[PDB]
Amino acid sequence: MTTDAPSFNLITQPWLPVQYRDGTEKELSLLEVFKQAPLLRRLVGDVPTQEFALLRLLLAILHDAIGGPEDSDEWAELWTQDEAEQQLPFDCIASYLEQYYHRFDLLHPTTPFFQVADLHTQKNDVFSLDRIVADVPNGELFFTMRARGVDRLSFAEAARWLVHAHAYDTSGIKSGAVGDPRAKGGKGYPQGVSWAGNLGGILVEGANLYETLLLNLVAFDTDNLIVTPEDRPAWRQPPTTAAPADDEELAQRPYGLCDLYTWQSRRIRLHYDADGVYGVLLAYGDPLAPHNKHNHEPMTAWRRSPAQEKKLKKPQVYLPREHDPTRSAWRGLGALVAGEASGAEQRGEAAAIVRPRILDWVARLVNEGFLPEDYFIRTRLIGVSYGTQQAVIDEIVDDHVAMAVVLLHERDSGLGRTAIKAVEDAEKAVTVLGGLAADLAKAAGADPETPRAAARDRGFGMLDGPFRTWLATLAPGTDATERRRAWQQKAHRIISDLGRQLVAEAGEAAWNKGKNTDVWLNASRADLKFRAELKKELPMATS
Amino acid sequence: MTTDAPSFNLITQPWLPVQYRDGTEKELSLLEVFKQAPLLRRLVGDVPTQEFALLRLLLAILHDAIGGPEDSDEWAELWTQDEAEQQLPFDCIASYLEQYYHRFDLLHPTTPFFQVADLHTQKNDVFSLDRIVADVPNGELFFTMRARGVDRLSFAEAARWLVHAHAYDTSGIKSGAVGDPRAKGGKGYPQGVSWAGNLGGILVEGANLYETLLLNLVAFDTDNLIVTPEDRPAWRQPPTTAAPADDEELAQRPYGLCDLYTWQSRRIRLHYDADGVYGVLLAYGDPLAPHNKHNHEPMTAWRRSPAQEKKLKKPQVYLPREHDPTRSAWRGLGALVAGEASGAEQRGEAAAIVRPRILDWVARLVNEGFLPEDYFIRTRLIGVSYGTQQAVIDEIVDDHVAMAVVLLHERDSGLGRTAIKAVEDAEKAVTVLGGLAADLAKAAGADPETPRAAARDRGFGMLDGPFRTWLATLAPGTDATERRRAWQQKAHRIISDLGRQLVAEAGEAAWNGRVNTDVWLNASRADLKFRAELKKELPMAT
């Protein structure tokens, strides 16, 4: 009967919410997700960051259950585009999970999944779940007795957040684990955000889940990737305690992709009962810092940081380039397609390192012919932008850039170039818009800062849909010039229309008697200047 | 028919959650609250920030309903300490509200309370209530699709958040009201946090709501206060638009306390059916820049900011001093008692200005013998620390300091001074502790930064409890020196014990058989030293 009290084994019970192609939504076991993968478009995380972390948990399973693709030649045998045929290796997989049945039990008596069975603070304080749940802040901070749907969670949903937390979690002062040799008086002083939280994260998506999974399943031989032979998932290493692993183990760690896509950044223990989960203890886990990890972490773009170089007295230092919630994904194709960022040059970045290994992996697949040039892909961007002192979550980033693969293959003078240059064009153009907002503010005696920053939003706002779609026109058949023109025309129209609205808005305010009719004349002046400079920045459009 | 006029008039319906002295919590009407004030211990806001705004609302009504306390003499005709007597002036009030019945109905078709009946987007979008609920952030920001209990609020709870929002609300990019001349294409770009969110707010609390209310009801003749004859609450001004009040108005505004405690920092409209409220529209209202507003806002400590003087080319600028969430209130006593803060001199701050008018009030009250010296008050600290670019709320600050009133009186060299120095003592002491954890980390070759950081926390942790109770010792009868000693003795005991545990914990390592004498040798030295200098910093100790 206590046999029912560890009843929740994630191999067999439903907990992973998924979305079949014919719309249907359902939660599933690990087993079944693998079985059904070609039939699902995606997972449906309680929150986008969940989808990322879980995917990684799946890839770690995959990676291990095969001893991962060593070659691309090896990877290749797993993969058809034939809709009727795609399966995963359910048979290798089942067998793999059959072995570790007992580590995948969430409610397990000692080896429970992703938690230390034994964690307590000194008073065995049981914290509420605002702690793991991400759209929910710690009641402590708002002083709330007021309940928020987070008093109780389902075994299923709890599991989700648990995995999520290890990936993505604030650098608070957390509560102190007993047996933690860092628990200075029952607290854990800040040790940094959990690992995935350092990344401007990047997965590849296909039409179904099967495709999504394989496309992200990097071969270990890939240029500038590091996969030591003892690489293994957290659940295939000795069960963790309150203490982090001693530094000499941490020394050659992560072992690789299984280890990393499973990294135990925290130490968690759920409090629960016959049918629910009511409480948690969340404490610090294993520190792993993002400096120069570009040879280990394929799911991020990198950027070089001279500040850190000077500070740590080391010659070269790279760091995850993080996502920026202000900008839409396509605004940094530069970095994704060819590893180019506007600082470049000055910091001494190598585009080779900047572009995510995982896009490198796909580019490699193309260059070798395992994928056609006109293959299509959502490149998904997922992160968290952490808040004040990295200790709160301000928001989550979930964007994507849908594109043909040619682009990665042709980052040089190919269509890759054209697309980057289209973005440069957009950014050039919005600036001309920014210019008008200022000229107009000045013509009305106001400060330029906010009206200009405002027009720039409306600018990128109005350009976005159209850009994304023009980006999708780019394919092996198409021409450089023909598209490059097609885009400038479009932008020019969008933006000079937006310009016109702006000018209208100015003349609305202009009388509500000397300085008055000045805004009309001078606005008009500012307007002609604007057209002229837009014709100049978009010279391909003339029409 | 009249059913066709769904209605929730705030004067009459239950919606302010209160606590009686006998524990019991009930929700109450405005009328019922004023009636039972001497019976009620406090307001229970869904969040302490409501309590601050909600009192201010209650305060506005009060001031206005009696043409506000002009003298302290007029004030005095409303107050005894006789629990058996203490009534408010319910009659003045009952009628005051009965008169403006039409402005206080939440769901009024044209004059709804604190909102604009008329308000819309271009495409008329109804946003979720994440916007006005403070515990809950935007669904948009998380892409969250499952309610965390905010699809629906009841009329009551909604009303509460509404008021809160006008006081306390993030300076996001917000939705553009149609009719707003600042709505560049359906969004209103950031324009600062709502008025109350500018203040490290301060209230004075009593044993019941009767006292809590009367205590904060300043006489308008009070020195350094600006209450124009115009002064009236939002419901005595014409109902507001999508538009801001024009510049020529906001020029000689706010009018005073009724105007200010009621400020229309946002423009809001509730979306409801017969039963609850399901949606909201929240847009920017009237800007109120907190610079040199010390003469209008009784409820914060002020601070002079030279950086801003430089920036604005003004010779002088005060700005509300906000609360610091890291530290306990009693650490800030300097400003609260005598307006003394450690930058003081450098910034050319006038202490006379820094101390909240609200305490200057209590001080004057005491000084004219209306409150006795030994009278006790909690001094409440409420704020919100706004997050990244003021667009998010990190946490809410809610603390307080229990004290006898004499502290505002003898602030020169008497009891007030001793309390101020007793704090400085605590600060001095914890650093001797900090030094220890540091010299220990060094004697081991660990980084000294977090051990020191931690050891400080524990220190102020272990001094908070006893300090607060040492403070409540100071009553007119007492001896300044005698108490100062007593406290220094206590600190020394407390902190030297904490020292011993730190020394213990470093040795814990190999106390339980688990591990260059230069550790033992040096760590031993570090211990003797901290003991030595803790004696020096608290010289009145044995």
Residue B496 identity? S
Q: Which CATH number fits domain A411-543: 3.30.530.20, 1.10.132.100, 3.20.19.10, 3.40.50.300?
A: 1.10.132.100
> Between chains, do A185 and B398 touch, taking CB under 8 Å as contact?
no
Using DSSP's 3-state secondary structure scheme, residue A293 falls into coil
Residues of chain A with Cβ-Cβ distance to B499 below 8 Å are none
Q: How many CA atoms does the CB half-sphere of B56 hold within 13 Å? A: 32
- Residue A328 is encoded by which pair of tokens? 């839409």
Interface contact A456, partner B, CB < 8 A: no
Considering the segment(s) B411-542 as one domain, its CATH architecture is Orthogonal Bundle (1.10)
- Residue A427 is encoded by which pair of tokens? 């950014």
> Between chains, do A143 and B47 touch, taking CB under 8 Å as contact?
yes
Nearest CA-CA distance, residue A395 and chain B, Å: 5
Nearest CA in chain B to A185: B458
Pairing status of strand A301-304 against strand A318-321:
antiparallel
**Touching A: B residues 377-396, CB under 8 Å:** 385, 387-388, 391-392, 394-396
Nearest CA in chain B to A147: B149
Backbone angles phi, psi at B27, to 5 degrees: -95, 145
> Between chains, do B135 and A139 touch, taking CB under 8 Å as contact?
yes
Rounded Cα gap, residues B444 and B462, in angstroms: 26
Backbone angles phi, psi at A255, to 5 degrees: -70, -25
Strand A393-404's sheet: what is its strand order?
A201-205, A376-386, A393-404
Q: Quick one: CA torsion of B384, B387, B389, B392, rounded to 10 degrees?
A: -90
What is the DSSP-derived secondary structure letter of residue B296?
Answer: T
Q: Work out the angle between the directed axes of helices A449-471 and A415-442 (0-180°, nearest 10).
A: 160
Interface contact B322, partner A, CB < 8 A: no
Residues of chain B with Cβ-Cβ distance to A142 below 8 Å are 47, 134-135, 395-396
Residues of chain A with Cβ-Cβ distance to B455 below 8 Å are 184
CA-based nearest residue to B134, from B363, B398, B473: B398
Exp. method: X-ray
Write the residue in A47, A143, A388 that is nearest to B143 by C-beta.
A47
- Residue A228 is encoded by which pair of tokens? 């030591």
In contact, A496 and A534? CB cutoff 8 Å: yes
Residues of chain B with Cβ-Cβ distance to A495 below 8 Å are none
Output the CA torsion sign for A410, A415, A421, A427: negative
Per-residue three-class SS string for A362-422 = HHHHHHCCCCCCCCEEEEEEEEEEECHHHCCEEEEEEEEEEEECHHHHCCCCCHHHHHHHH
> Between chains, do B398 and A143 touch, taking CB under 8 Å as contact?
yes
Interface contact A48, partner B, CB < 8 A: yes
Residues of chain B with Cβ-Cβ distance to A27 below 8 Å are none
> Between chains, do B141 and A394 touch, taking CB under 8 Å as contact?
yes
> Between chains, do A147 and B142 touch, taking CB under 8 Å as contact?
no
All residues at 6 or more sequence positions from A437 whose CB lies less than 8 Å from its CB, including other chains: A448, A451, A452, A454, A455, A456, A502
Rounded Cα gap, residues B7 and B112, in angstroms: 10
One DSSP character per residue, A121-137 reads: -TT---B-GGGT-SSS-
Distances (CA, A) of B146 to A148, A150, A157, B151: 12, 12, 12, 9
Nearest CA in chain A to B138: A135
Rounded Cα gap, residues A306 and A318, in angstroms: 9
All residues at 6 or more sequence positions from B120 whose CB lies less than 8 Å from its CB, including other chains: B177, B178, B269, B281
Mutate to test the interface with A, among B50, B135, B502 (most CBs of A within 10 A): B135
Rounded Cα gap, residues A12 and B283, in angstroms: 49
> Between chains, do B392 and A396 touch, taking CB under 8 Å as contact?
no
Mutate to test the interface with A, among B47, B51, B132, B143 (most CBs of A within 10 A): B143
Distances (CA, A) of A150 to A49, A238, B383: 18, 32, 25
Residue A26 identity? K
- Residue B201 is encoded by which pair of tokens? 């707010």
Count of Cβ atoms closer than 10 Å to residue A460 Cβ: 20
Rounded Cα gap, residues A202 and A403, in angstroms: 14
In contact, A200 and A381? CB cutoff 8 Å: yes
Rounded Cα gap, residues A526 and A510, in angstroms: 14
Rounded Cα gap, residues A401 and A377, in angstroms: 8
> Between chains, do B451 and A137 touch, taking CB under 8 Å as contact?
no
- Residue B3 is encoded by which pair of tokens? 């059913």
Rounded Cα gap, residues B263 and B194, in angstroms: 9
Taken as a whole, chain A contains a residue count of 543
Write the residue in A392, A450, A457 that is nearest to B387 by C-beta.
A392
B526 membership: H or E segment, kind and range: helix B518-537
Residues of chain B with Cβ-Cβ distance to A396 below 8 Å are 141-143
Nearest CA-CA distance, residue B459 and chain A, Å: 11
Mutate to test the interface with B, among A130, A136, A143 (most CBs of B within 10 A): A143
In contact, A507 and A498? CB cutoff 8 Å: no
Domain spans of chain A? 1-410, 411-543
Rounded Cα gap, residues A47 and A116, in angstroms: 25
Rounded Cα gap, residues A422 and A333, in angstroms: 10
In contact, A348 and A354? CB cutoff 8 Å: no
Residue A163 identity? V
Count of Cβ atoms closer than 10 Å to residue A536 Cβ: 10
Nearest CA in chain B to A461: B185
CA-based nearest residue to B380, from B205, B230, B509: B205
Rounded Cα gap, residues A326 and B199, in angstroms: 29
Write the residue in A142, A453, A505 that is nearest to B396 by C-beta.
A142
All residues at 6 or more sequence positions from A251 whose CB lies less than 8 Å from its CB, including other chains: none
Output the CA torsion sign for B503, B508, B510, B516: negative
Using DSSP's 3-state secondary structure scheme, residue A251 falls into helix
Rounded Cα gap, residues B12 and B100, in angstroms: 12
Rounded Cα gap, residues B247 and B238, in angstroms: 16
